[model samples]
Target: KIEEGKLVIWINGDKGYNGLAEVGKKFEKDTGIKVTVEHPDKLEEKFPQVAATGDGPDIIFWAHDRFGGYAQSGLLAEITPDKAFQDKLYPFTWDAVRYNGKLIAYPIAVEALSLIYNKDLLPNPPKTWEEIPALDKELKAKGKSALMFNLQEPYFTWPLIAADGGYAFKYENGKYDIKDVGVDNAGAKAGLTFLVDLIKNKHMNADTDYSIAEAAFNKGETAMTINGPWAWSNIDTSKVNYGVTVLPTFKGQPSKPFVGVLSAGINAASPNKELAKEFLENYLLTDEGLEAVNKDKPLGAVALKSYEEELAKDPRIAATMENAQKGEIMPNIPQMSAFWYAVRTAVINAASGRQTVDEALKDAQTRITK
Candidate 1:
C-alpha cells in the first residue's frame, strides 16, 4: 500500500487538466490528499509502457479506446462504479468504458461530430446528405462552399462509411469480434462512393484537411462544417452565426458518427488503489466536479444523464446530445488500431481516384487481415 498522502495523474490536453485541477483542489482540501497533474506529449504511446513498469501515475485521463490494450495487458485496475453511479450515465457511455465485463474507467465527457452551420448563409440547414450537392451548387453561385470536412481523415469519413453499414468490427454480447470485418461491406462501399463523387465533382475538395476545413468555415468561406464541439472555441461567433445540429442522414438512415468518451482510468500497479478509487467515485464524478471541468469548454455532450439534461439547456449541447444518442460508441478494442490506418488509406485512395471503391476497400481489408 502507498504510504504517501499524494497522488499523481497524467492527463492529455489542456482542457482536461484544467477541469481536473479544480477537482484536485477540492480533493486535497477535503481529504488532505495532494493530487499532482501532469500533461505529457504523445501520452497514448508513453502511458502503456510506463504503466507496465508499475511507475505510472495513479490515474490517467484519456479516451476510452486505448483502455482495451492496457486492460488486456493487466495495466488497468477494474473500476466498479456503483449501480447508482452507472444509472446516471447514458447506457452507451457506460458500455464504452467496459472491457471483458469490467468497468476500467470513470467516464467524464462524450463527443461526436455534428452539423455546425453558418445560419446567415443557410436559413435552414439541409435535412439530408443527399441535399448537400444542390446546396453546394447554390453556394458556389454565391462564391461560397456549402460544406467542408477533412476528406483525407478516416475519423471524419467514418460517419459516411457507417451510414451505409460499414463498421470496423462486429460488436456482439459486449465483445468486439475482429473476425467480423465490415470495412468494405456493401453499405460502406455505397457511402464511400457517395463521398468520392462529391470530391470528384468539385463540391468538396479532396485536398482540404481538418485545419483547412475549419479555417474555411470560420472565415465564412464555407457555409457549414462537420466537426465536433472541440472546434467551437476556435470559431468567432460574432463573425459566424453558428448553429449546431445532428449530422444529416444518408439515404434516410442516421449517420452514425463515432462517439468518443473522455474518461479516467486507474493504474493497476498503483500503490494507492483504494484511495484512487475513492477519489474518482466520490470527488471527481460529482455534479460540481463535472461542472468545473466543463465550465470553460462545453466539450461535446455530457455523459451523466442528469447533468446532460441540465447542460442541454444550451441549444448546442442539446444538439450534440441528440447526435450522441444516434451515434455509435467507439469500440474500445486493440484491433481498432489496425482499422484506423486501413480505413484512412481507403478513404484517401477512393477520394483521389487512385483506386476504385472495390480496390481501395479490398486493399484496406487485406491490411486489416494481415
Candidate 2:
C-alpha cells in the first residue's frame, strides 16, 4: 500500500511483530509518511553493518546508548530543529540524547529501577541491605528464599554499590574519568557481599535466570526482586499482595541506578528525514502520539514542564518520574559503551563465586578503560 518515492524505512523488525510496529502505525497515520519496515532477525549484527555501509534506517527505536556510539562514529544525523521546538523538549531529556556538542537523538521513554516485593511474604520490606541478610536468614529458616537479583548483570548491582557510596565512574569536565572504577572499592565490595551473603545463607539460589526468578516472585516462591517499570503492567497483582518501593539505601544514601532513556533517533540515511522529524513533533512527542509509550512502556516524558496533566493523573508513574538527582543518567561518552558489557560480565562472575569480588571488578575496570 506504500506509494513509490515514499521513503522506505527499515525498522529493526516488522511492524506488530515484536518490533515498534504500533508506534510505526501511529507515525505513518500522523505524518502521511509511508514507511516500509525491514527487520532482520539479528538486529545487533545487522544495524552496525548497515551503518558501516552508510545505509541505515531513517528512524531507530532504540536506547540512547546506541545513539551515543553512532554519533561518535559520525553515522547518525545531527538534528537542528527550530529554537522553539528545541525549547519545547525537557532540558535533561534533550541533553541525554546529545553526544559531545551535537544533538543526535530524541528522548522517547525513560526508565528507573525499583524494588518489588510480595507483601504477603514480607509484611515489612527491609530499609537497607543490612536488614536483608537477617530477613534472608529468617526466610531460610522457614524454607523460603527471601530475595533474588540479576546475578548475571552488573547493571542490576551498580545501584547496590552506589548505596554504599561506590561508583563505577564519575563524569567531570567533558570526559568520563575512571577515578573510582573498581568493583572491590569498600562500598562496592559491601554491596556484592550483601548479595553473595544471600546466596551463601541460602536465601537466593545463584543458578536462577532472571525470568525464572521473576516467575518465582509471581508464583510467590521468592519474596522480593529488584525491577523496573516495565514489569509493573505485566504483574498480576490480583493474584498476590504486592508492594513497590525505592531501592533501599546504605549509609543513608538511596541506591543509585543507571537510569536510561529509551528514545527515537532520525536516521541520516532516510529520505523522509524531515517528515520523520515532523512526526516526532506531532505524534511521538504529543499526547496523541504516545499511547504506546504510556500504556506499554509506561515512562513519563522528559519534558515534564509541558505535559503537566499526565503527571497529575498517574502518581505511580510519577515516582519513577522523580528527577535524576541521585540516579546516574546513562553516560553519553562514546567510551561509555565499553562500561556496561565489562561490568556485567564481572558482576556475574563474582556473584557466581567464580572469582573474588576484587578480582572480578579489577578485570572489568581494566578491560573497559583499556
Candidate 3:
C-alpha cells in the first residue's frame, strides 16, 4: 500500500502547476498529507512508461481530449462523482470527461474561439459574414484590413463548417461514429466557398499566417480577428482597445466553435489511488480550490457553477460562455489524429484556390477513412 503522508501529482505546464501550488499547500496543511508536484515536457508520451513501472503520479492535470485514449488503454481510473458533485458542473463538461460510459476526470475549464475586435477600428463588431465585405471596404479607405487569421489552420476554419451545418464526426449512443465524417458534405463545401470568396475579394489571403494576423491586430492594422483566450494575452493593450464576443455568423447561421475542456484524472495503477480520489473529490472539486486554480485563466468558463457570477463579470469569460452554448465538443477519439491533418490540408487547399472546394473536402474524407 502507498504511504500515509504523501502524494505525487503531474501537470502539463507551468500554468497548471503554478495555479495549483496554493491549493496543494492548503490540502497538505489541512490533511497532513505531503504533496509532490512535477511538470513533464512530454506528458502523454512519458505518462504511460512511468505509470507501467508503477512510478506515475497519483493525479494529472490535462485536457479531456486525451482521456478517451488513456482511459481505453487502462491508464486512467474511473471518476465516480456523486449526483451532488455532478450537479455542480456543466452537463457538457461532465459528458466530455466520459469514455465508453465511465467518467475519468473532473472537468475544470471550458475553452472556445470567439471574435476579438479592435474597438477603435470597428465601433461595433459584425454579427454576420454579410457585414465583412463592407467593413473591409471601409477599412481599406483607412489603409487597414477588416479582419485577419491564419488561413492554413483548420481549428479556426471549423466554425464556418459548423455554421454551415458540418461536423467532423456524428455522435451515437454516447460515442463518435468515425464513419460519419461530414468534412466533404454540402455544408462544408458552402463554408469553404465563402472562405475562398474572402481571399478572392482581397479581404483576407493565404499569406495571413498566425504571426501576421496577430501582429496586425495588435498593431491596429486589422479591425477584428478570430482567436481563442490563449492568444488574448499577446494583445498590446496600449496600442489597441479590444472587445471579445461570440464568432460572427456565416450566411446568417451561427458559426459554432469547438469547445475543449481541461480536467484532472487519476492514474489507474497508482498505489495512492484512494488518497488521490479523496483529494480530487473533496478538495480540488471545492469552490475554494477551483477559485485558486482559475485565478489566472479567467477566459475559460469554469465547470464549477459557483464561479459563474464571478466569470460573468468579466466580458472575456462571458463571451466564451455564450459561444460555448453554440459550440460542439471536439470528439475525443484516437481517430481524431487523422481528422486534423486531413481537414487542415483541405482548408488550406480550398482557401488558396489551389483545389476545388468539393475535391479538397473529398480528399480529406478519403484520407481520414484510409
Q: Global lDDT of each model? A: 0.72, 0.61, 0.71
Tell me the tens digit of each residue's lDDT in model 2 across 1-370. Answer: 1122344445433222323446567677655667555655466556667856656555666667556577666656768676787666556666667766668877655555445677464456667777766687698888877776556656566767777777767754334566556554667776677777767656566677566666777776778766642212244432322222456667566666665665676667555467777756666565544555455434554453456456536766565666353455665355555777777777677667898877887787787667
List, in order, the clash count of every candidate structure.
1, 3, 0
Better of 2 and 3 by lDDT: 3
Q: Which candidate gets the maximum TM-score versus the true structure?
A: 3
**Which residue ranges in model 3 land beyond 4 Å of their true spot?**
113-157, 163-190, 198-255, 296-299, 331-370
lDDT of 3 by residue, 83-103 (tens): 887877777777767776667
Ranking of models by TM-score: 3, 1, 2
lDDT of 1 by residue, 198-309 (tens): 7787746668777777678777677776654222224333222232344578886777666666677788887768888788778776779877777745565677777777
TM-score of 1: 0.60
- State which candidate, 1 or 2, has the greater lDDT: 1
Poorest 10 consecutive residues by lDDT, candidate 1? 235-244
Q: How far in Å is the alpha carbon of 233 misplaced in model 1?
A: 35
TM per candidate comes to 0.60, 0.55, 0.61
RMSD of each: 8.2, 9.0, 7.9
